[PDB]
Ligand binder design. Structure first.
Ligand SMILES: CCCCCCCCCCCCCCCCCC(=O)OC[C@H](COP(=O)([O-])OCC[N+](C)(C)C)OC(=O)CCCCCCCCCCCCCCCCC
Ligand SMILES: CCCCCCCCCCCCCCCCCC(=O)OC[C@H](COP(=O)([O-])OCC[N+](C)(C)C)OC(=O)CCCCCCCCCCCCCCCCC
Ligand SMILES: CCCCCCCCCCCCCCCCCC(=O)OC[C@H](COP(=O)(O)OCCN)OC(=O)CCCCCCCCCCCCCCCCC
Ligand SMILES: CCCCCCCCCCCCCCCCCC(=O)O[C@@H](COC(=O)CCCCCCCCCCCCCCC)COP(=O)(O)OC[C@H](O)CO
Ligand SMILES: CCCCCCCCCCC[C@H](O)CC(=O)SCCNC(=O)CCNC(=O)[C@H](O)C(C)(C)COP(=O)(O)O
Lengths: 86, 606, 99, 64, 173, 75, 57, 172, 459
């Protein structure tokens, strides 16, 4: 497997939020804090991190699942959990 | 004294060289896997010549080489017996592991200890070809644990994985239960027949080996993972894929079955013992297959399919069919080994994922891997004129065409139908569907190492039984006049099992959802065996060890009865003796008493 | 402070002083010599020639002499036709069993 | 270190002879020993009973 | 031959002459052929070289022979000087008898492979010879204890004709 | 890319393993040569019948030359 | 070559060897008292050689 | 700490759907049943009676404890998965590298030189970061395992060495 | 005879008069040399024991133990020069004096021709071991452990003294040859039982059987490395040697009186091996394993069967060498971690790769994995016991079953698994420790080729 890098993560990350129809593409920002500006319900936040979980193939613990909130921070927690540094 | 005898022995000495070269440490620390693979390849090519000498002539050797040591009337000697069983198991086992060796390079292209890995495989390989080739019971006993301990290390290849050690500990324990039966047969044969060489045991016609055969049976059940002693083999999936593809697929696990084939002449003389052989094989066939069709890991499916096969093998040895059992060993060696590397192909390529619920659509993604699996699946089910037909279709017809237990005979038919059932489950979920793996697809099988290894085993499975059956001398009684209704049963049940399994599998495509049936809650949990029998007895014996035993006896009672009581008695009366008042009046009064008793009362004067 | 004592000394690493330390003592030159002594008079003198000594020890327990008497005895025994080896050992003819 | 102490040394000083400990010690002590004595005694009482009357077969049993 | 044929009776081998009818070549013959000029001959050339070197400087060795000595049934009570010769002679015969059982056991085991599927009935002579020897061996040394001595062997034997003569008296009636 | 892999020092183990292969073989090959050499120089004695008027030497009752020499020199 | 000192620190290496040399001496001295039945056991007693006088030393 | 109710239902929602995925397997079924499972979740979102929400929770997992797949789906890297600490046996602690023989260390000079720098920072940073910890430690011992950052500039966050120098999850 | 004794005692002045730092060297030089000379003794004749004089003789049983003891002597010196380096020269010389004086007594005891002479240094071995356990032992409970070890054997040995002198006043000499040739059938008079009990219990104590085995765990754990091996690799075998010599005049009383000891032993091995399955101390786990193997020998010797005797000696050498290795294993990781708890230092294989291999083959040998001599010993006893009675295989085999679990239990807990994070003092293993380990394991496999050497007089 080729070394997956942070640029690859974010490209794959915002791909799925753009896919998520309640997150319409135009107002997607790397730091788009979900319910403050996208209005995305926290009960669907627990639904998107498992979408991330199948996207990259691993488990996000519940302790930081509710903490995993910002799309940039989505990438941030992805990188260190797989020591993605490049 | 042809080259047969000499070069059939040198075959063994070939595979020992990679071990010796490795210990020098001058050995090539880079291309060692290539070194050993080619070494096994030459050992295979050498192993042909004894075979081609066999079907022509039919001579089987006994090589009583260097005399180890003599025990009065016992002459324990390293002796190799090149029976028809040994003269053909040697090529097929070498051929399979050579195919595995090529596949192993591709699969473990990143393991840092790869050279150690290949060294372990040879040591296992050495331990087995001295197990199959064993003129005396002692060197047969040599392999019986040499293969077991080699399995332990190989299973625990990923040392850090806590479960892998638990599975590794599980494998040796269940094997060790069988060795109790093994040593029991050992003691009886030496005490009564005064030997361990298989020749003297046969000649001394021990036609009432009640305890010996029971001991042999218990040894087989642990090694071949029968009911009561099965779950270690399904739990042996925590080891790496090529490890399971070789040992716990068609080579190591079949050793237990091979034991009775060695002792078949004494086995048939008794009537009582072979009853529970086919009884044990019968129950093993369901429970392994019954749990097979409900698991969701390819490694779990395939292994349970193996244990169902070894369930079927002992059914054959049940009703006086040893030779067909050994035939089934050879066929099982080809297609079953293929299925694991085929599953290993989709595992590694699809990012080491083993949950059967994540594949689908792999038919077009992996044309060769899908092609290999369906041929293997058909071979396992027993499609006519292809591998399994020459053994399983003969067996199912044979066990039906004999005076057997009625329940045992019905047992095989359900297993054969269930044999197709999980076979469809693999082909349906893994291949015939839509993609379910993570979005990044890294599907790949174009590596020549995988292609050459699978194809090498594939062309072997295609013909397989045709060559062996036509070449070996006719050495079983062939039943001829079968009523057509039961002669088709070998094909009816599997075709029937195909229909319902297919209908049940695509019922998942149906939008309806159902809560778990209690039967599914039973079958899917490995048939309820590991949840109880690995938790209840383990807790009691362990709790007995600490609460009782050590604490109760060793550290409390055994130190109180003898040591502490004497110490307490000595101290309690030492203080009263030493506690004196220091007044002469009391001491002198004691002298007056002492004089009085000594003078008269104690009759010292008279 | 209970008693005027010393703190538990730190376990010195033989490697940090001399990285080629052999774990036999502190001083390097004798350490290297201790290597030579243990391996020479260990593996080399005792293990190698000692194994050859015991391997090539002369006839022990008369294992082969007993054999050489066996075939000449058995060949004689079946030459005459009398039983191969008598069930009795001390010839009963000279035994003077009581009553 | 507390666990090792409580499981190695701090047993007998905290041990007190009570009917629960007393019966358990006897049950797991002399109990199995006498039980195995009885089993082997009768088995070794049935074995020779066969061979003095010649009711057992050891025609090829020599290396006892 | 190095060993003796009388001690190890080998029935003549009945090897059939090769008479094939199929036209395609018989491979096995070729494998023996290319083995002969690749392994067998070079081994023989080396072997004939070592044998001629061995015969160049030939040194001899013989077999030690112990003459008969008074055994324990005529050795005087106590008198361990006579017991020593008695015990040593008896123990020497013990090893010889153990080897005698070994010689029979190999012959019995030799029949198994030699007779193949005919083992059950072809060498019933081998079976009875071992049965006769094993039974006689039992009367000689069996159940003598790990501290077996010629005194115990005499003691166990003396019981045998004691019971036998008692049975003889009962049989006479 | 290529990045540093961490691994416990094998030098002491490697040096130690090299020492057996030196010191064991130090007497290994000369002994192995010697055992072979006596087998290509004087061979093995044959079972000769005891000649008349001469009882053998104490060490003579052995066939292998090394066993005879060991008996000659030690026992 | 430091010989005045090399003997001082390496004279201990000779005690055990001469001990073994000494050990054989008592081994080959005590047996003489144990002669007694020299060539007297009828199992091994046999005619003497013309020159040799003691069968086993 | 305080496992508040809203975290519980989210954990209930996450794992139940994971089990639900293990059941439908096929994506269309999984998508369908998740949406209805989603709908029956948020429909009851207006309950001023928090006790009633707990009561509605009490029978929830009980059905789940029946609805649980006996073999749920776990990505292998996670606990229970096939690839759990599979590569643990390869990762070795960094401090062991200090043992390396000088010849072995000479094989990697600049990396070992960079290690020397890391040894240098961790030395003075330890006193700095421990000093920060003591001066801001809450009274009566720490209340939560959470660790404060480096308040001032330049200094490293306290107790950073083992987390930062932790061996990579894929060491080979 | 004297060719081994005098060099051993002459070694004592050498250590006392050697240079300040050469004591370990010069002692190691000739301790290996003594084993070489003892290896020459290993030759045995057909049936007559190799007799030297009235004072000393050797048979096919004493010689394998003799070479084992002399072979051991370098190993304690190798294994001890790590925790005694920071000691004054006199105490080091005094320590070395203890072992060779101890090793001298073992040579004398096994070669003894008279039971009383056997008896005198049978007790004399304790005086150096008591000093070693108490003085240089590194613990607190060593004081009580020394008392337990000393008093237990004395409580059994003194009745033997009264028994042995009784034989002297009733049957003249107690020379092993004369006692064997003039053996008489011991009667079943109620005094003869107590005659039998006294002649047996002395060896029973220093051959730990169930009940009379509580001195072993405290002695083995608390003693230093050298004391642990000598007390576990040769000392326990002193009882074994005693029986083979002394049951010559205990038959047929041994036929009936064997039952209480057989029942205590066969059941004891299952219990003791069960203790191993849940031991917290690594040294204690190895110590209890010695009880199980020795208890297996107890059944072997007490059966009095040719096969049982042969396996008894086979297990006798194998267990001693293996237990010595395992005590080296526990000792080699102890000072690195400075504790004895097994779970404290997990995942040692990742840090120390060779120790994983050494500990691996140590486990297999203790496993009685064929063809290691342990298997030959155990397997021989199984057949001998099975001929004695058919049921015993249930007990016999179950021991092998339990032996598999606990032997691998130390392997998985210590070698395999995740390394513990906090420890950082584990340095790469010294080549001395590695060499000492191969010094143990290699002769074991070398013995596999020639079991006849260690089978015993019954062969
Ligand atoms: C080509 C290679 C061949 C290899 C052959 C196999 C290896 C042989 C290794 C031999 C040396 C190692 C073993 C020495 C054993 C000690 C000697 C012994 O057994 O008894 C002492 C022996 C016998 O004791 P003795 O001298 O009282 O014996 C009296 C009887 N005669 C004289 C007939 C032997 O001592 C001597 O023979 C004295 C001379 C010095 C011997 C020195 C031996 C060690 C050095 C060599
Ligand atoms: C012809 C000869 C060919 C070369 C033979 C070379 C040797 C060999 O392999 O022999 C095979 C022979 C095989 O016997 P054989 O019956 O096959 O005959 C040999 C000749 N050929 C092979 C041609 C038939 O076996 C032995 O010699 C046994 C070797 C045993 C070695 C034991 C070593 C022990 C070392 C102990 C060290 C520690 C001591 C202290 C501790 C003791 C324990 C407590
Ligand atoms: C005489 C000839 C008789 C021939 C009988 C042939 C029967 C063939 C097998 C049919 C039943 C098993 C089957 O179809 O298994 C496949 C399948 C798996 O379903 P499941 O595991 O629930 O996974 C669903 C995932 N969404 O669908 C299932 O329904 C699995 C059901 C699991 C339990 C099966 C129990 C079978 C019992 C057979 C008899 C045993 C002895 C009584
Ligand atoms: C810690 C307690 C002991 C531990 C276990 C030790 C073994 C248990 C048995 C101990 C026996 C010790 C005494 C044995 C000495 C030798 C016995 C012997 O040779 O047999 C004699 C047996 O004779 C005896 O009476 C021996 C003693 C029997 C037991 C009585 C004393 C021993 C028990 C109490 C002392 C030890 C207990 C500890 C006390 C603090 C034969 O003589 P006889 O009586 O046949 O003489 C001829 C004729 O019949 C009349 O004399
Ligand atoms: C197989 C299937 C088995 C069966 C599987 C489970 C299905 C059946 C159980 C479904 C839930 C149950 O009916 C009721 C309950 O436990 S809770 C109701 C919602 N009320 C609350 O939880 C408290 C107030 N609300 C919040 O805390 C937030 O609104 C919330 C976190 C919920 C949303 O996220 P945000 O917005 O914070």
């Amino acid at each position: 497997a080729p070394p997956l890098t942070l640029e690859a993560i974010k490209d794959r990350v915002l791909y799925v939020l753009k896919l998520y129809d309640k997150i319409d593409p135009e107002k997607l920002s790397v730091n788009s804090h979900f319910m403050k500006d996208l209005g995305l319900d926290s009960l669907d936040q627990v639904e998107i991190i498992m979408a991330m979980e199948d996207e990259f193939g691993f488990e996000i613990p519940d302790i930081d699942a509710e903490k995993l909130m910002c799309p940039q921070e989505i990438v941030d927690y992805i990188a260190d959990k797989k020591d993605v540094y490049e | 004294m042809n080259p047969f005898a000499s070069l059939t022995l040198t075959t063994l000495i070939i595979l020992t060289i990679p071990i010796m070269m490795s210990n020098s440490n001058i050995y090539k620390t880079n291309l060692y896997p290539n070194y050993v693979k080619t070494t096994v390849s030459y050992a295979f090519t050498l192993s042909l010549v004894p075979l081609l000498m066999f079907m022509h002539t039919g001579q089987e050797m006994i090589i009583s080489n260097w005399h180890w040591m003599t025990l009065q009337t016992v002459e324990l000697s390293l002796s190799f017996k090149m029976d028809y069983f040994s003269v053909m198991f040697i090529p097929v086992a070498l051929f399979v592991t050579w195919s595995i060796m090529e596949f192993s390079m591709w699969y473990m292209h990143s393991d840092p200890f790869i050279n150690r890995f290949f060294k372990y495989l040879v040591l296992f390989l050495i331990t087995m070809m001295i197990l199959v080739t064993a003129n005396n019971l002692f060197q047969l006993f040599i392999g019986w644990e040499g293969v077991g301990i080699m399995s332990f290390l190989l299973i625990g290849w990923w040392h850090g994985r806590t479960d892998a050690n638990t599975a590794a500990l599980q494998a040796i324990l269940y094997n060790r239960i069988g060795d109790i039966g093994f040593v029991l047969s050992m003691a009886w044969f030496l005490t009564h027949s005064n030997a361990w060489d298989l020749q003297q045991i046969f000649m001394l016609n021990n036609e009432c080996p009640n305890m010996p055969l029971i001991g042999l049976l218990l040894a087989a059940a642990g090694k071949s993972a029968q009911f009561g002693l099965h779950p270690w083999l399904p739990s042996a999936m925590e080891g790496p894929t090529p490890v399971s593809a070789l040992l716990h697929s068609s080579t190591m696990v079949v050793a237990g079955v091979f034991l009775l084939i060695r002792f078949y002449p004494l086995m048939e003389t008794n009537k009582l013992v072979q009853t529970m052989t086919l009884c044990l094989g019968a129950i093993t066939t369901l429970f392994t297959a019954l749990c097979a069709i409900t698991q969701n890991d390819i490694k779990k499916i395939v292994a349970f399919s193996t244990s169902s096969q070894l369930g079927l093998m002992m059914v054959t040895i049940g009703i006086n069919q040893p030779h067909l059992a050994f035939l089934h060993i050879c066929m099982h060696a080809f297609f079953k080994a293929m299925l694991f590397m085929c599953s290993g192909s989709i595992i590694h390529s699809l990012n080491d994922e083993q949950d059967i619920r994540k594949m689908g659509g792999l038919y077009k993604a992996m044309p060769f891997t899908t092609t290999a699996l369906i041929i293997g699946s058909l071979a396992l089910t027993g499609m006519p004129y292809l591998t399994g037909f020459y053994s399983k279709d003969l067996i199912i017809e044979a066990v039906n065409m004999s005076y057997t237990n009625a329940w045992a005979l019905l047992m095989t038919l359900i297993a054969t139908s269930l044999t197709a059932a999980y076979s469809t489950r693999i082909i349906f979920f893994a291949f015939l569907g839509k993609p379910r793996f993570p979005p990044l697809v890294l599907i790949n099988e174009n590596n020549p190492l995988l292609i050459n290894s699978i194809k090498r085993l594939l062309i072997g499975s295609i013909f397989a039984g045709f060559i062996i059956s036509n070449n070996i001398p006719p050495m079983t009684v062939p039943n001829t006049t079968m009523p057509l209704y039961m002669k088709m049963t070998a094909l009816i049940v599997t075709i029937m099992g195909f229909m319902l399994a297919l209908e049940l599998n695509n019922t998942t495509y149906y939008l309806k959802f159902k809560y778990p049936s209690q039967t599914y809650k039973f079958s899917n949990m490995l048939g309820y065996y590991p949840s109880i029998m690995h938790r209840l007895p383990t807790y009691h014996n362990l709790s007995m060890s600490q609460k009782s035993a050590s604490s109760l006896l060793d550290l409390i009672w055994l130190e109180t009865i003898l040591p502490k009581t004497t110490s307490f008695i000595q101290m309690k009366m030492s203080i009263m003796v030493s506690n004196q008042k220091g007044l002469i009046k009391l001491y002198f009064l004691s002298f007056l008493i002492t004089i009085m008793i000594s003078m008269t009362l104690f009759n010292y004067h008279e | 402070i209970r008693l005027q004592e010393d703190p538990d000394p730190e376990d010195e690493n033989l490697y940090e002083k001399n990285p080629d330390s052999h774990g036999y003592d502190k001083d390097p030159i004798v350490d290297l010599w201790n290597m030579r002594v243990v391996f020479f008079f260990g593996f080399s003198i005792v293990l190698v020639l000692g194994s050859t000594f015991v391997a090539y020890l002369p006839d022990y327990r008369m294992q082969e002499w007993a054999r050489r008497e066996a075939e000449r005895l058995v060949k004689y025994r079946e030459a005459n036709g009398l039983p191969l080896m008598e069930s009795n050992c001390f010839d009963p003819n000279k035994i003077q069993l009581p009553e | 270190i507390r666990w090792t102490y409580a499981r190695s040394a701090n047993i007998y000083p905290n041990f007190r002879p009570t009917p629960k400990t007393s019966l358990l010690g006897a049950l797991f002590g002399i109990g199995p020993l006498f039980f195995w004595y009885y089993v082997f005694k009768t088995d070794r009482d049935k074995k020779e009973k066969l061979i003095q009357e010649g009711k057992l077969d050891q025609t090829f049993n020599i290396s006892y | 031959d190095s060993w003796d044929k009388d001690v190890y009776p080998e029935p003549p081998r009945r090897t059939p002459a090769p008479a094939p009818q199929t036209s395609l070549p018989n491979p096995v013959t070729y494998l023996t052929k290319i083995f002969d000029l690749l392994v067998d001959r070079p081994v023989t050339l080396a072997r004939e070289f070592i044998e001629q070197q061995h015969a160049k400087n030939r040194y001899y060795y013989y077999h030690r022979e112990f003459r008969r000595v008074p055994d324990i049934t005529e050795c005087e009570e106590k008198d361990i000087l006579c017991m020593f010769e008695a015990e040593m002679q008896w123990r020497r015969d013990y090893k010889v008898d153990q080897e005698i059982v070994n010689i029979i056991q190999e012959r019995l085991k030799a029949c198994q492979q030699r007779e193949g599927e005919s083992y059950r009935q072809n060498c019933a002579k081998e079976l009875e010879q071992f049965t006769q020897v094993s039974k006689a061996f039992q009367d000689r040394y069996s159940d003598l204890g790990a501290h077996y001595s010629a005194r115990k062997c005499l003691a166990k034997q003396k019981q045998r004709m004691l019971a036998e003569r008692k049975a003889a008296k009962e049989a006479a009636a | 890319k290529r990045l540093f892999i961490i691994k416990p020092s094998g030098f002491y183990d490697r040096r130690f393993l090299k020492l057996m292969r030196f010191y064991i073989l130090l007497t290994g090959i000369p002994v192995a040569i010697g055992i072979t050499l006596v087998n290509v120089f004087i061979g093995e004695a044959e079972l000769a019948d005891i000649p008349e008027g001469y009882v053998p030497e104490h060490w003579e009752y052995f066939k292998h030359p090394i066993s005879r020499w060991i008996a000659r020199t030690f026992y | 070559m430091n010989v005045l000192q090399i003997v001082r620190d390496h004279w201990v290496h000779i005690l055990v060897p001469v001990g073994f040399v000494f050990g054989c001496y008592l081994d080959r001295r005590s047996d003489e008292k144990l002669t007694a039945f020299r060539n007297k056991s009828l199992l091994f007693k046999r005619e003497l050689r013309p020159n040799e006088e003691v069968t086993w030393k | 700490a305080y496992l508040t109710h809203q975290q519980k239902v989210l954990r209930l929602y996450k794992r139940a759907l994971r089990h639900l995925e293990s059941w439908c397997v096929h994506r269309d079924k999984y998508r369908y049943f998740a949406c209805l499972m989603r709908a029956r979740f948020d429909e009851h979102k207006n309950e001023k009676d928090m006790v009633k929400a707990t009561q509605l929770l009490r029978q929830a997992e009980e059905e789940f404890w029946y609805g649980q797949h006996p073999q749920p789906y776990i990505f292998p890297e996670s606990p229970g998965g096939t690839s759990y600490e599979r590569y643990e046996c390869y990762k070795v602690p960094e401090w062991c590298l200090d043992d390396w023989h000088p010849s072995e260390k000479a094989m990697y000079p600049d990396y070992f030189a960079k290690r020397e720098q890391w040894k240098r920072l961790r030395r003075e940073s330890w006193e700095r970061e421990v000093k920060q910890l003591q001066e801001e430690t809450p009274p009566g011992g720490p209340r939560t395992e959470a660790l404060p950052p480096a308040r001032k500039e330049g200094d490293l966050p306290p107790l950073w060495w083992h987390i930062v120098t932790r061996p990579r999850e894929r060491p080979m | 005879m004297l060719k081994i004794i005098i060099p051993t005692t002459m070694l004592l002045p050498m250590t006392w008069m050697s240079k300040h730092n050469m004591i370990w060297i010069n002692a190691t030089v000739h301790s290996l040399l003594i084993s070489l000379i003892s290896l020459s003794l290993l030759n045995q004749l057909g049936e007559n024991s190799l007799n030297f004089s009235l004072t000393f003789f050797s048979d096919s049983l004493s010689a394998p133990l003799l070479v084992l003891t002399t072979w051991l002597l370098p190993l304690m010196l190798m294994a001890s020069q790590s925790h005694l380096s920071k000691e004054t020269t006199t105490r080091k010389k005094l320590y070395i004096t203890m072992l060779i004086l101890l090793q001298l007594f073992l040579i004398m005891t096994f070669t003894a021709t008279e039971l009383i002479l056997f008896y005198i240094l049978f007790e004399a071995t304790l005086v150096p071991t008591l000093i070693i356990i108490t003085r240089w032992g590194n613990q607190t409970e060593r004081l009580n452990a020394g008392l337990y070890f000393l008093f237990y054997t004395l409580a059994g040995s003194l009745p033997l003294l009264v028994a042995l002198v009784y034989i002297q006043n009733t049957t003249g000499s107690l020379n092993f040859l004369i006692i064997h040739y003039w053996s008489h059938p011991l009667s079943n008079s109620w005094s003869n039982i107590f005659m039998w009990l006294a002649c047996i219990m002395a060896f029973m104590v220093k051959m730990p059987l169930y009940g009379l085995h509580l001195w072993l765990p405290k002695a083995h754990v608390e003693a230093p490395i050298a004391g642990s091996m000598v007390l576990a690799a040769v000392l326990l075998k002193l009882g074994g040697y005693g029986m083979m010599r002394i049951t010559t005049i205990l038959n047929p009383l041994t036929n009936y009186m064997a039952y209480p000891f057989l029942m205590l032993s066969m059941w004891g091995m299952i219990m003791t091996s069960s203790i191993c399955l849940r031991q917290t101390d690594l040294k204690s786990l190895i110590a209890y394993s010695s009880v199980s193997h020795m208890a297996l020998v107890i059944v072997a010797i007490m059966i009095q069967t040719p096969w049982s005797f042969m396996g008894a000696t086979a297990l006798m050498i194998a267990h001693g060498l293996t237990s010595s290795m395992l005590f080296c294993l526990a000792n080699t990781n102890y000072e690195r971690v400075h504790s004895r708890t097994m779970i404290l230092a997990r995942g040692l294989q990742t840090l120390l790769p060779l120790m994983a291999t050494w500990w691996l083959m140590a486990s297999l040998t203790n496993l009685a994995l064929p063809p290691s001599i342990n298997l030959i010993g155990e397997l021989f006893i199984i057949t001998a016991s099975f001929s004695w009675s058919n049921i015993t295989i249930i007990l016999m085999g179950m021991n092998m079953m339990i032996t598999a679990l606990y032997s691998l239990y130390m392997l998985i807990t210590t070698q395999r698994g995740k390394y513990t994070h906090h420890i950082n003092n584990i340095k790469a293993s010294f080549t001395r420790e590695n060499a000492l380990m191969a010094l143990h394991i290699l002769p074991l496999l070398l013995l596999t080729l020639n079991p006849k050497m260690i089978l015993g007089p019954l062969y």
